[PDB]
A paper describes a structure:
We report here that the cooperative binding of doxorubicin (Dox) with actinomycin D (ActD) enhances the specificity for consecutive GCCG sites in DNA. In this study, we investigated the mechanism of Dox by combining it with actinomycin D (ActD), another potent DNA-intercalating drug. The structural basis of Dox-DNA intercalation has been reported previously, where Dox prefers to intercalate at 5′-CpG sites. The major mechanism of action of Dox is intercalation into DNA, which inhibits the enzyme topoisomerase II, preventing DNA relaxation and leading to DNA damage and cell death.
To reveal the basis underlying the preference for the GCCG motif shown by the combination of ActD and Dox, we determined the cocrystal structure of a ternary complex in which both drugs are bound to the d(AGCCGT)2 DNA (1.57 Å). In the crystal structure, an ActD and a Dox molecule are each intercalated between the G2pC3 and C4pG5 sites in DNA, respectively. The ActD-binding step (G2C3/G10C11) exhibited higher roll angle (3.7°) values and a lower twist angle (10.5°), resulting in significant backbone unwinding. Conversely, at the Dox-intercalation site (C4G5/C8G9), these values were reversed (roll = −3.8° and twist = 31.5°), indicating overwinding of the backbone. At the ActD-intercalation site, there are extensive stacking and hydrogen-bond interactions between the phenoxazone (PXZ) ring and two threonine (Thr) moieties with guanine bases G2 and G10. At the Dox-intercalation site, Dox has three hydrogen-bonded interactions with the N2/N3 atoms of guanine G5. In addition, a water molecule mediates specific hydrogen-bonded interactions between the amino sugar nitrogen atom of Dox and the oxygen atom of cytosine C8. The orientation of the amino sugar ring of Dox in the current structure differs markedly from that in previously reported individual Dox–DNA complexes. Additionally, the side chains of ActD and Dox are in close contact, with a C–H···O 3.4 Å interaction between the carbonyl atom of the Dox side chain and a carbon atom of a valine in ActD. This helps to ensure a snug fit, prevents steric clashes between the two drugs, and enhances their specificity for binding to consecutive dinucleotide steps in DNA.
Author numbering: 1 to 5, 7 to 11
The structure:
DNA sequence: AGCCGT
DNA sequence: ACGGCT
């Protein structure tokens, strides 16, 4: 996720 | 640590 | 079949 906590996605 | 869609 | 950052 994020970043942080990419995306998702990307 | 933290999920999704080319 | 298989990748994206702080
Ligand atoms: C052992 O790999 C996996 C095993 C189980 C599920 C997964 C994957 C997986 O590798 C995977 C991905 O690599 C990707 C995604 C994904 O959901 C998974 C799994 O679910 C989603 C993503 O497609 C998008 O966000 C499109 O916008 C990008 C990424 O795709 C990669 C490869 C694609 N061919 C394309 O080049 C895309 C741009 O990046
Ligand atoms: Cl790439
Ligand atoms: Mn990990
Ligand atoms: Mn899927
Ligand atoms: Mn992977």
């Amino acid at each position: 996720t994020x970043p942080g906590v990419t995306x998702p996605g990307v």
